[PDB]
Every structure is written in structure tokens, then in C-alpha cells.
Structure 1
Amino acid sequence: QQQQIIKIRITLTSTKVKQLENVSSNIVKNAEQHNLVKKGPVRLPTKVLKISTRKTPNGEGSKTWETYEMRIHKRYIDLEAPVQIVKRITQITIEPGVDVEVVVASN
């Protein structure tokens, strides 16, 4: 009767930085409060979705191009945590835009 540790791995990803980092920091805080070892707030290389296209709808006009780009910021956070805290930490921390995932059984 230990309430056994399972090595949780959260994987946050979003197009926003301030709305995402907020959730990250919150996760860091709550998880700290419960007194658990963890693997950082590890941040990944931000992925730029670049789309090059002509400005004009039809061929006439000086040949002007237009970069249209969307950011993808991604954070993975490993909480070496018990079976108790999974349900407590999953229910909290939800946000429009911030795509949240959680995964376990690391091998």
C-alpha cells in the first residue's frame, strides 16, 4: 500500500507562447507542491509552418511573394509521480489553443 509511482510524461503543444508557458509553469508549481521528482519543463525546437505564395489572385502585376507562417511551440514534461496524482493533475490545466497530451509506460 504505497500508492505506486508510474513515470508520467505530459506533452503540451500549441500555437501560442504565453497561453502555453502559463500552463507549463502551473504544472511545474502544482507538481512541486506535491513534492515529486521530475524531468524539467523541457522545451523542444519550435516548428515554423512556412507557406510561400504569390500575393495576386491572377498572374498580372509585379511578381510579389508572401510568406505566411504559423508557429508550433512544444513542451514535454516527465513527472515521476504516483497513481494518485494522475487524476488530480489531468483534470486541472485546460485551455483553448493549448493541445494537451499525457502518456506513460516509458521503455
Structure 2
Amino acid sequence: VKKVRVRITLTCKNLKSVEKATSEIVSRAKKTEQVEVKGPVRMPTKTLVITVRKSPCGEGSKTWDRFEMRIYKRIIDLTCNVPDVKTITNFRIDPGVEIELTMTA
């Protein structure tokens, strides 16, 4: 049994989509026999803040726009062979959702 510990990383600009991949990746991996999954772990939500003075010309009172971009990173671990992973990654995952993979023994 050539077992390979696989690291599934998922980083995304919005929560709607990243939670689907996470939810379904596990849903799908648990259902395979050659599978061992470490629960979907949620890293701390990083927030990029950009505060901007509204108006273009500096007139009128002080108006500030607080803009945010949230980035959720989820991490999943897998006990499988090399084909097993490519079997579970066969989803239909939304755009702008980066998925990185690490293979160790």
C-alpha cells in the first residue's frame, strides 16, 4: 500500500464558494475506501483593509471609505495514493478559488 499524505489548500476571495469546495471535498473523500481525511481546518481569516478619502478633490468634510477584501484559507489532509486525489478533485469548483496540493509519504 503506497500511501501518500496529501495536503489540500484552498484560498478564496469570498466565503460562499470556498465553503462549497471544502464541504464537498470531504463529503467526497469520506465516501472512498482508500481514504483517510483530517477534518477541514479553517485557518484565521486574513483581512486586507484599505481606507480611502472618498471625494477626488479634497473639498467638503472628511469622508472615508473602509474597503475590505476577505481571504479564507481552508486546509484538508488526505491519506491516499496519487490516483485517489485526482479522483476526488473532479468537482466543478467556482472561479477565483486557488487549490494547491502537497504530497508526502
Is TM-score (shorter-chain normalized) higher than 0.5?
yes
Match of 1:60 in 2: 59
Deviations 1:15-68 (A, max 9, x none): 121211111111011100003222110001111110011011011110111111
Q: Equivalent residue for 2:11? A: 13
**2:27 match:** 29
* C-alpha separation in 2, matches of 1:87 and 1:14: 21
Residue identity (%): 48
Unaligned regions of 5+ residues in structure 1, if any?
none
What one-letter code is carried by the residue in structure 2 that aligns with 1:43?
R
Superposed CA RMSD: 1.6
Q: Extract unaligned runs of 5+ from structure 2.
A: none
User: Number of paired residues?
Assistant: 104
Provide runs of 4+ in structure 1 moved above 6 Å. Answer: none
Q: Which amino acid aligns with 1:27?
A: I
Give TM-score scaled by structure 1 length.
Answer: 0.87
